[PDB]
Write a protein that binds this ligand. Structure first.
Ligand SMILES: C[C@H]1O[C@H](O[C@H]2[C@H](O)[C@@H](O)[C@@H](O[C@H]3[C@H](O)[C@@H](O)[C@@H](O)O[C@@H]3CO)O[C@@H]2CO)[C@H](O)[C@@H](O)[C@@H]1N[C@H]1C=C(CO)[C@@H](O)[C@H](O)[C@H]1O
Ligand SMILES: C[C@H]1O[C@H](O[C@H]2[C@H](O)[C@@H](O)[C@@H](O[C@H]3[C@H](O)[C@@H](O)[C@@H](O)O[C@@H]3CO)O[C@@H]2CO)[C@H](O)[C@@H](O)[C@@H]1N[C@H]1C=C(CO)[C@@H](O)[C@H](O)[C@H]1O
Ligand SMILES: [Ca+2]
Ligand SMILES: [Ca+2]
Ligand code: NA
Ligand code: NA
Length: 481
């Protein structure tokens, strides 16, 4: 009954073309552990075979055409992906496709383009006269031809680029007659430009094409929803319209979550307001609180976890998470939740009633970067918490955020899920005890810590209270034996 997402990739997975097959093979395990949706990495051809998927060369090449030195994407072929999806669907696991429509990388050829430089800290400020540059803006798709779409891209479908091939130079170039799109993040004056060739969402052929591709992509992979990439950099009204368009065409709900990367609830609320609340956002501020708590050695005030997050104010529109492919060690938003704290963060997202929680592949199975700082596989510590969510985290919640270190919450259980109910404690410092109310309806039950961190049993008194224990820097989640 509780819904649980999984981001089914991390940055450093090996480029062996076996990921879709792995996902197919993991579908029974995922279903068994209560995963109800997976967010899959971008499924279309990037700038090379080892592209993680954000390069976005050809949105109509799902590992089907020999383009960029490969047929398969990093993850495998279209057919392998489709077989993975049909296995996931056979166990009622929904699939959300990653949508990378800010830009296009790896153009087939350059074009001579008139441009001006802009200031990278203030892209509204022009910093050169007009100059002739050689931009990677011509997309012909020679391996695909016109199969599925005859649409070709040229410089006038884009607002700019970050590379002039003639002078061999990295700056932000805005093309002649173009304007940065609005509304976008006001960071750096206007944050339309991010990388590669930036798509011009003022162009009516582009808006039409991307909407049409959206429907095609949904059909081709039988997607149940979307993860929207880089939404700070894409006209907000367009994103709103695109989501509405695909929903209208498919006739499906198409649950959507956007990645608006800002550690600021106000900025996220503005984005939600400008997209009419028609989709969810990742709870970026909550991720940063977990990171802060995990790095402050008990000095963090754990009461802070209740405030300043998307889940605290718009729980229906929050997708909560601990880490992702950008926050993992070595990556561009590095702010990793330290190993010791990571199960406590998972208890917070998985066993509390607010938010749509997401588990990270890198946390479950470890990350495969080349450092000695990789996330170890924490499957075995996360599994009991997943089970707590699947079987026990139902009914009315009571919060006990009344201490700098030891905080907890309870769930009374619901008569629709037999034996449901839980009492969770986490602490970023010394352990201890807390008396918490779990419901008079649970009076006399004997509860035990599903994580196995504590071996003691707790008998719920006549008044519906138990005395629950937690170890130092630990988590305990008590449920009925
Ligand atoms: C990879 C990521 O890049 C972009 O994110 C940038 C943020 O927009 C900036 O605001 C800034 O973030 C800082 C925070 O504002 C601040 O709270 C601070 O504590 O640290 C943050 C890191 O400096 O810098 C970010 C990094 O440039 C972009 O907005 C975001 O969407 C990007 N993530 C996705 C996009 C792409 C491109 O398709 C992929 O490379 C990623 O894997 C995606 O997940
Ligand atoms: C999985 C589900 O997550 C989202 O909905 C959940 C909210 O995020 C939670 O906060 C909670 O909502 C309650 C509020 O916390 C509370 O303040 C009060 O307003 O009552 C709310 C309703 O009880 O619980 C919600 C789940 O009931 C998200 O909005 C929703 O779209 C998500 N559902 C999709 C997911 C799956 C599979 O994972 C599909 O089966 C569904 O069809 C999708 O709709
Ligand atoms: Ca853009
Ligand atoms: Ca524009
Ligand atoms: Na643009
Ligand atoms: Na603390």
């Amino acid at each position: 009954l509780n819904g649980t997402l999984m981001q089914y990739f991390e940055w450093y997975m090996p480029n062996d073309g076996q990921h879709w097959k792995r996902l197919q093979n993991d579908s029974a395990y995922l279903a068994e552990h209560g995963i109800t949706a997976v967010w899959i990495p971008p499924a279309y051809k990037g700038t090379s075979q080892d592209d993680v998927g954000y390069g976005a060369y050809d949105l109509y090449d799902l590992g089907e055409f020999h383009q960029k030195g490969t047929v398969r994407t990093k993850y495998g072929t279209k057919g392998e992906l489709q077989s993975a999806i049909n296995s996931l669907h056979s166990r009622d696991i929904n699939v959300y496709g990653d949508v990378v429509i800010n830009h296009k990388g790896g153009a087939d050829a350059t074009e001579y383009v008139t441009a001006v430089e802009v200031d990278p800290a203030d892209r509204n400020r022009v910093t050169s006269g007009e100059q002739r540059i050689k931009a990677w803006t011509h997309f012909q798709f020679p391996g695909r031809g016109s199969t599925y779409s005859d649409f070709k891209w040229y410089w006038y479908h884009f607002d700019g680029t970050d590379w002039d091939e003639s002078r061999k130079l990295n700056r932000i170039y805005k093309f002649q007659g173009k304007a940065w799109d609005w509304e976008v993040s006001n960071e750096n004056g206007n944050y339309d430009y991010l990388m590669y060739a930036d798509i011009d969402y003022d162009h009516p052929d582009v808006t039409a094409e991307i909407k049409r591709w959206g429907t095609w992509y949904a059909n081709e992979l039988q997607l149940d929803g979307f993860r929207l990439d880089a939404v700070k950099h894409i006209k907000f009204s367009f994103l709103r319209d695109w989501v509405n368009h695909v929903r209208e065409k498919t006739g499906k709900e198409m649950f959507t979550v956007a990645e608006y990367w800002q550690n600021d609830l106000g900025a996220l609320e503005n984005y939600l307001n400008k997209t009419n609340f028609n989709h969810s956002v990742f709870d970026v501020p909550l991720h940063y609180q977990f990171h802060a708590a995990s790095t402050q050695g008990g000095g963090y005030d754990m009461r802070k976890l209740l405030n300043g997050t998307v889940v605290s104010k718009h729980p229906v529109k929050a997708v909560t998470f601990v880490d992702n492919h950008d926050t993992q060690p070595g990556q561009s938003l590095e702010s990793t939740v330290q190993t010791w704290f990571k199960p406590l963060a998972y208890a917070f997202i998985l066993t509390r009633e607010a938010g749509y929680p997401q588990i990270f592949y890198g946390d479950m199975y470890g990350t495969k970067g080349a450092s000695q700082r990789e996330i170890p596989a924490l499957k075995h510590k996360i599994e009991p918490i997943l089970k707590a969510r699947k079987q026990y985290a139902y009914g009315a919640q009571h919060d006990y955020f009344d201490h700098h270190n030891i905080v907890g919450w309870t769930r009374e259980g619901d008569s629709s899920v037999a034996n449901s109910g839980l009492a969770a404690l986490i602490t970023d410092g010394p352990g201890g005890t807390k008396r918490m109310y779990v419901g008079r309806q649970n009076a006399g039950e004997t509860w035990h810590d599903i994580t196995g961190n504590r071996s003691d049993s707790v008998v719920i008194n006549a008044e519906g209270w138990g005395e629950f224990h937690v170890n130092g820097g630990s988590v305990s989640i008590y449920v009925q034996r």
